[PDB]
Amino acid sequence: DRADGQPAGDRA
Amino acid sequence: QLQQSGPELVKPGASVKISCKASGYSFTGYYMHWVKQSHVKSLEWIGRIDPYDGATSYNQNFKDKASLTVDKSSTTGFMELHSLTSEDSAVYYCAREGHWDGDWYFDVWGAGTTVTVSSASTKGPSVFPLAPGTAALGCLVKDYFPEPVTVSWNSGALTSGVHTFPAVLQSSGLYSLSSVVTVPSSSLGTQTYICNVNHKPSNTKVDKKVEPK
């Protein structure tokens, strides 16, 4: 499984 | 969970790399983020790294100041700060963005790494006894640089009644603090009291037995 996170962590 | 490296004394203009060792979970399944705490009530998100492929995302305020890497073999994350100024002295945290029941949030934090940007040299403290129904005894931890110093009593077995005061600055520019403990007066003479002082920047580890004079 791959990491995910809250959207404020990525410019997209 | 997350174990960060020890405090750093860094010259202005030099760079520093601090680390965060992960254990007990799948290192490559979770983002590692870094956070700056500059004053008692100031938190800034620096950026994050995907430990699986090393992909990074920076707060634009830090894209030149900080570089994030990982070492997959040793499941360790790193943040390097470049060209330090006094504005970079702060406590820096690593945090894991974990997930519970489909949602993600910062669910694990390291204890923080204190970085002090300074032209001055490191100095270990000298440790002097504060000799004693309640009695008080303690240790005076004097003339060290930089922060921090940690103090424990009897190797961590004595915790109740302990007060380790915040460091104050002396006219010499060096820090000083005291750690005290209140104990039953009836235990002075049968119970040994030792303050264990550790100032990692100078490799100073002192154990001082405190007894009535």
Next chain:
Amino acid sequence: DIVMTQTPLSLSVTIGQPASISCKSSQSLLHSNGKTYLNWLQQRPGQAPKILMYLVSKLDPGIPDRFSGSGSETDFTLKISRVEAEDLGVYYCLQGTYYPFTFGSGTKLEIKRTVAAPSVFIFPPSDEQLKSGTASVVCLLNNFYPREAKVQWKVDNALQSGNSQESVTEQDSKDSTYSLSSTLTLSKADYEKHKVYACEVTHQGLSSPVTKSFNRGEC
């Protein structure tokens, strides 16, 4: 970047009373995907921040049920139904909707409790320290409230001024009291020219001032 504004920036509460902290964001934190990424964090003295709840009001397991959050769009509130002594510290809101993550300036939560008088101790300088050229005399005030205290040093009855330094602990997370150290710093020669060293403590919890003293060289 989203500006997070917290209200108030500091508040004191009696153990058992409710507490509320407000957070206002410069833009609605409602993401296009339907979720509202508002987080509340607590930072106790000396420790790392810790998530209390995420997505506005979803509590991290292990956080006591007395914590709850609400709000939407641009206005959010953190509430503690009944404050406990361990709730002291700094509280932050954190938005995770718009890159980059931004925190608010923390709100400091202090505990109000009843007056408590300090117990006072005085420590002479050690001989080891006197072997170098300096003498430090330490006065300890233990487990008192409120924080305000007057500690005066008298050497052979002469009030000292400008040669002492104080340090105060953070509020204790168990009994909500403070402790205080006052250090009188003298050259070895000045220390050896006098006999009686005393710290005199004035405090709301003391009906009249308390003095602890020693005679130099009388164990």
